[PDB]
Ligand binder design. Structure first.
Ligand code: DCD
Ligand code: DCD
Lengths: 308, 308
């Protein structure tokens, strides 16, 4: 209630380790591991807003929706997104309620279904870039496409090939006002799972567009709207590398960015979201592993991005 | 801020009319027509908690998970419920946002993923009861029940066959405290979609159990815990009939239930629900149609159950 606010973005490893399978039990066990790292942040007295990504979960749901179109009507990707929030938000808040009760603190936590407005004219709708669901073999992918020419797949960090979808820039977290209310009251809020159900607003009406927003760009948005004290991005990497970055200034990480020093790995969007947050608020952004989250806040490690 | 609280439970006709197929646009429209009716109550200045049922939606998701098992990991019933909460909740909060903005009130609504504790030793777990998904033929039910020995199907109000799942009585809404924080702050809250994801607690750890909870009892319990000033079960039918029932007594409606006046149709749990709320709270339960929600509160029509 006097504690500072940290907005924390979980990554894949909160549910799926290096190419496990997305069965419920595997994911829950992963989420219970994450929930104990996050609790420490709560215990240290910070107010927490928890987001996460979508990739495998919405991918799997859209896959189940194609594979069963014969039997049950097929749902659009935005509706699949909605279902992923239900699912992810469910594991998250169940795992957080158990860690709460495992420390004899009454459960006080919610997941909010979350819409995120985007520009329908965004170039991302002509150019899918965001990998989702399962990994396929180069040859497995090559032929999956020959079957369904609509389907686009691409090679994902070398690990294999993946279905790819539109990933527009997030403009507004629709439920922003309620989230703010909930942290003002010290609720551990879970939301913006997978970046929010992409939508557009067109003369006073919101409707779902088919896409998966970047979990980092969208969490940066939310964090800066909430005028949060910290932005944390949680990976399975100990540091954002280029060499690794420890405490680093906005000026520097900026020059390092425009010189394509992050152009390879998956760190490009994360670095971009840290930068945007620190530019907009002047407060610190952190990129560390799920496993060193408290320590980063404490100054002990991670990449901490700071104002000039 | 000054408004009384009404806890409102939507029925099927909220998302599916009779003989409609459960694709997205069909469901969105029905939701949109209900958002319109519910927005009158908000305008009248009531504090609104919105709940709904699940049956056709969670059934569909479970059928998708079954049908796509060769390709994607099939998820348990409780997870499928959470996914339906995300989908219904999304549709509902988006319609609500749209009505608000249509009438120049900025949006202020959210859907909360909800868990409902139940007793793992409820008799319903070994006597599957709650119908779910789409209607089959006597023909179509036995093939399924024989290619699936353990699939269970039964008739339902005289229209055809349907999968059947444990329907345990609800003991507690886990997110209750956060829901109450929300109406206290004048957020139109949508929760308990289909009665909430059935869970059990043992040893201070919550875990999903494979059921589907009757939406009405769960809202009755929610309203009862919230100390709502009203309980509204909305249906497509306009009175809890047997003689027409207008404003009626707790003494009397109780008797009619015992003289078995609702017993075989589709009212039993709804009247039980209301009786139980008014009984524990001395507050008014209502059972009108969607088309007459305001009018009912406006003490024009309905079934208005009242204490002696
Ligand atoms: S940073 C850096 S150099 N690495 C690889 C050891 C992080 C995986
Ligand atoms: C009772 C029929 N009706 C209006 C005539 C609705 S269910 S909306």
């Amino acid at each position: 209630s006097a504690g500072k606010t940290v907005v924390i973005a979980l990554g894949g490893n909160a549910m799926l380790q290096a190419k496990e399978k997305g069965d419920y039990d595997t994911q829950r066990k992963n989420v219970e591991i994450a929930a104990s790292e996050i609790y420490k942040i709560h215990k240290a007295g910070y107010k927490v807003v928890l987001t996460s990504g979508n990739g495998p979960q919405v991918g799997a749901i859209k896959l189940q929706n194609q594979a069963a179109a014969g039997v049950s009507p097929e749902m659009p990707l935005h509706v699949c997104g909605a279902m992923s929030q239900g699912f992810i938000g469910y594991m998250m808040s169940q795992a957080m309620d158990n860690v709460f009760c495992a420390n004899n603190e009454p459960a006080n936590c919610v997941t909010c279904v979350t819409q995120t407005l985007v520009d329908p004219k965004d170039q991302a709708f002509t150019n899918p870039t965001k990998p989702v669901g399962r990994f396929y073999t180069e040859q497995e992918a090559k032929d999956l496409m020959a079957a369904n020419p609509g389907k686009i797949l691409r090679e994902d960090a070398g690990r294999g090939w993946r279905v790819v979808v539109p990933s527009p820039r997030p403009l507004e977290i629709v439920e922003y006002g309620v989230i703010k209310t909930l942290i003002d009251n010290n609720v551990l809020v879970i939301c913006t799972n997978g970046g929010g159900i992409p939508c557009k607003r067109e003369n006073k009406v919101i409707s779902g567009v088919d896409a998966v927003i970047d979990k980092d760009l969208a969490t940066s948005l939310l964090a800066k709207t909430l005028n949060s004290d910290y932005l944390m991005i949680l990976t399975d990497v100990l540091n954002a590398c280029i060499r690794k970055l420890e405490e680093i200034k906005l000026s520097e990480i900026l020059a390092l960015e425009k010189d394509g020093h992050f152009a390879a790995g998956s760190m490009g969007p994360k670095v971009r979201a840290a930068i945007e947050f620190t530019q907009a608020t002047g407060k610190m952004s952190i990129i560390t592993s799920l496993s060193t989250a408290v320590d980063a806040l404490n100054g002990k490690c991670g990449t901490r991005i700071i104002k000039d």
